Amino acid sequence: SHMDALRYHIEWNRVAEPGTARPAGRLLAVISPDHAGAPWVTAVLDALGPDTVRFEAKGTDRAAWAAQLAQLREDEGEFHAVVSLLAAAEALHTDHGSVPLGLAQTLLLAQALGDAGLTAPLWCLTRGGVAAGRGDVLSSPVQGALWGLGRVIGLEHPDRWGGLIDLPETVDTRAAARLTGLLADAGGEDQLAIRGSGVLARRLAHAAPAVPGSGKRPPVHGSVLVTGGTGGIGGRVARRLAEQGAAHLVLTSRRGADAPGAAELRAELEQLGVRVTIAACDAADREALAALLAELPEDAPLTAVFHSAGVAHDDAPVADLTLGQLDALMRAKLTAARHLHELTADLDLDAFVLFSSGAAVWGSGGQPGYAAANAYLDALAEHRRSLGLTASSVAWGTWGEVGMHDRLVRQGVLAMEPEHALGALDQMLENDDTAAAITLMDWEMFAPAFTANRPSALLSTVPEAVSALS
Ligand SMILES: NC(=O)C1=CN([C@@H]2O[C@H](COP(=O)(O)OP(=O)(O)OC[C@H]3O[C@@H](n4cnc5c(N)ncnc54)[C@H](OP(=O)(O)O)[C@@H]3O)[C@@H](O)[C@H]2O)C=CC1
């Protein structure tokens, strides 16, 4: 339908076995020195071999790394590639409590490589940051955030970007040869997962047309929490839920009952019959969330979460983004969603819906922070599935009418009518799909623009993008 035509999903398809020769020139491996002990880090360093130059990226100091890298580059001449193992640093940064250290260090590595004039393509490796292949388990949502950042590095610095590669749990010599072969020549691919069966690469496809009933979505009832529920998209979601008979809607935001439009929204929802609670509740404050959940009465237990809290403002190009700007974009996404997961994992929820963005699914220049933050959401929904919990992630394109533009519409990410976007969301929930993008695209505008500087294997599975590029 029209609503079906907004839904896309990510799939992973088999690509060519790589060649057998390792790279001719010298690799530079980047290690986070406090987080260099995971088995897959050892296995990758052993696969790169002992002639690989090693750089320990200590702390988060862009100017000190630029000077260290410039010396390496002077002494070695041109590297074949830079292979980052920084993703193994999952612990939170000591000064930026919503930023995984390896995410901070990956940003600063991309920055310092540019500053020093190292031009060799940067490859960011992860372990468990994607769910690729039937049955695969996304074990690290934190490393999954890195993929959101990496895709935006590829759009802002295409000439010095290699790609992303997720490693299996056991990096055997077949996996190792796949890795070193890809580093020699990746066949134009740049979003790759090495698995036992072969190498897979990431693809965007139209989602299957809706099948009513197929997901056995239970009737909306009980208490439903909508973070960011006082307005834009969260408010429209709340209205849909009230139309569909919710008993009690708990709407939160930092401003709560003081939010713009909040009183009008409460009155409109109440006219439908729904009990409304509005709370001023920072979604990343764990104690406030717990207090809100403790207030729910016996007769209206929590049945669903819709996580719409978030900001996109105060992002910046990769070359300029600060760790304090990245912490502020992460906080309502990573920190808040981690708390929502931890405090509801035992409640047997009917839905746990995380609102992501096209910035995280395909990438948007100028939005590295927002891409990382929303890629963490997508990765958490797949991780939660592996635990047997419900979860979904919905990556929006551009909304019309309400919510958070001119650049994006000009690049062919067109504004959706709210009712069509909401009806596409309902199709995803009735199917019980784990992940989708819901976006109106003009592919004839989007594909040539998005690929002007480097090809995108991601879009090869969208026939409208192939036709635009013909
Ligand atoms: N509009 C669009 O085209 C798209 C939207 N999205 C995503 O959908 C979600 C909703 O966006 P939209 O409605 O358009 O944006 P709005 O700015 O209209 O709504 C976002 C809301 O989140 C609340 N919020 C922000 N930070 C926090 C926080 N730390 N704790 C609790 N609430 C917070 C805001 O209220 P307060 O400031 O009072 O906290 C507001 O209620 C966002 O997560 C966004 O990333 C994704 C793609 C596209």
Ramachandran assignment for 399, one of left (phi > 0), alpha (psi -120 to 50 degrees), beta (any other): beta
CB 32 within 8 A of CB 103: no
Closest CA to 217 of 349, 115, 320: 349
Phi first, then psi, for residue 191 (nearest 5°) are -140, 90
Closest ligand 1 atom to 254 CA? 39
Question: CA dihedral defined by 16, 22, 126, 466, rounded to 10 degrees?
Answer: -30
| CA of residue 285 to ligand 1 center, whole Å | 16
CB 371 within 8 A of CB 151: yes
Burial class of residue 134 (count of CB atoms within 10 Å of its CB; 0-12, 13-18, 19+): exposed
Residue nearest atom 12 in ligand 1 by C-alpha distance: 403
Phi first, then psi, for residue 81 (nearest 5°) are -160, 165
CB 265 within 8 A of CB 235: yes
Sequence-distant (6+) residues with CB within 8 A of 426 are 240
Phi first, then psi, for residue 242 (nearest 5°) are -65, -40
Tokens of 330: 């992460």
Residues with CB under 6 A from ligand 1: 227-228, 230-234, 252-255, 259, 282-284, 308-312, 331-332, 355, 357, 396, 398-399, 403-404
Residue nearest atom 34 in ligand 1 by C-alpha distance: 228
- Method underlying the structure: X-ray
Phi first, then psi, for residue 300 (nearest 5°) are -140, 65
DSSP bridge partners of 277: 250
| CA of residue 48 to ligand 1 center, whole Å | 43
Q: Hey, what domains does the chain have and what are their CATH numbers?
A: 1-470 (3.40.50.720)
Ramachandran assignment for 6, one of left (phi > 0), alpha (psi -120 to 50 degrees), beta (any other): alpha
| Size of the chain in residues | 470
Question: How far does Cα 340 stand from its chain's mean position?
Answer: 17
Q: How many CB atoms lie within 10 A of CB 470?
A: 4
**Distance in angstroms (rounded) separating the CA atoms of residues 142 and 100:** 7
Residue matched to tokens 């929904």 = 381
Residue matched to tokens 């077949």 = 174
The three-state (H, E, C) secondary structure of the chain, written as one string: CHHHHCEEEEEEEECCCCCCCCCCCCEEEEECCCCCCCHHHHHHHHHHCCCCEEEECCCCCHHHHHHHHHHHHHHHCCCCEEEECHHHCCCEECCEEEEEHHHHHHHHHHHHHHHHCCCCCEEEEEECCCCCCCCCCCCCHHHHHHHHHHHHHHHHCHHHEEEEEEECCCCCHHHHHHHHHHHHCCCCCCEEEEECCEEEEEEEEECCCCCCCCCCCCCCCCEEEEECCCCHHHHHHHHHHHHCCCCEEEEEECCHHHCCCHHHHHHHHHHCCCEEEEEECCCCCHHHHHHHHHCCCCCCCEEEEEECCCCCCCCCCCCCCCHHHHHHHHHHHHHHHHHHHHHHCCCCCCEEEEEEEHHHHCCCCCCHHHHHHHHHHHHHHHHHHHCCCCCEEEEECEECCCCCCHHHHHCCEEEECHHHHHHHHHHHHHHCCCEEEECEECHHHHHHHHCCCCCCHHHHHCHHHHHHHC
| CA of residue 355 to ligand 1 center, whole Å | 9
CB 435 within 8 A of CB 392: yes
The C-alpha angle with vertex 91 and arms to 117 and 120, in degrees rounded to 5, equals: 20
Resolution in Å, one decimal place: 1.4
State how far the alpha carbon of 461 is from the alpha carbons of 13, 182, 281, 465, in Å.
10, 21, 42, 8
Breaks in the chain, named by the residue before each, with C–N above 2.5 Å? 404
Phi first, then psi, for residue 322 (nearest 5°) are -100, 160
Sequence-distant (6+) residues with CB within 8 A of 430 are 210, 211, 212, 213, 214, 215, 217
State how far the alpha carbon of 331 is from the alpha carbons of 53, 307, 336, in Å.
35, 13, 6
Which amino acid type is present at position 387? L
Tokens of 218: 């239970």
**Distance in angstroms (rounded) separating the CA atoms of residues 149 and 106:** 9
Closest CA to 96 of 273, 279, 329, 339: 329
Q: How many CB atoms lie within 10 A of CB 399?
A: 21
Q: How many CB atoms lie within 10 A of CB 463?
A: 12
Q: How many CB atoms lie within 10 A of CB 358?
A: 22
Residue nearest atom 18 in ligand 1 by C-alpha distance: 232
**Distance in angstroms (rounded) separating the CA atoms of residues 186 and 44:** 17
**Largest interatomic CA distance in the chain:** 73
Which amino acid type is present at position 42? T
Residue nearest atom 40 in ligand 1 by C-alpha distance: 228
CB 326 within 8 A of CB 279: no
Pocket test for ligand 1, best of 226, 230, 237, 254 (most atoms within 8 A of CB): 254
Which amino acid type is present at position 35? H
**Distance in angstroms (rounded) separating the CA atoms of residues 322 and 307:** 25
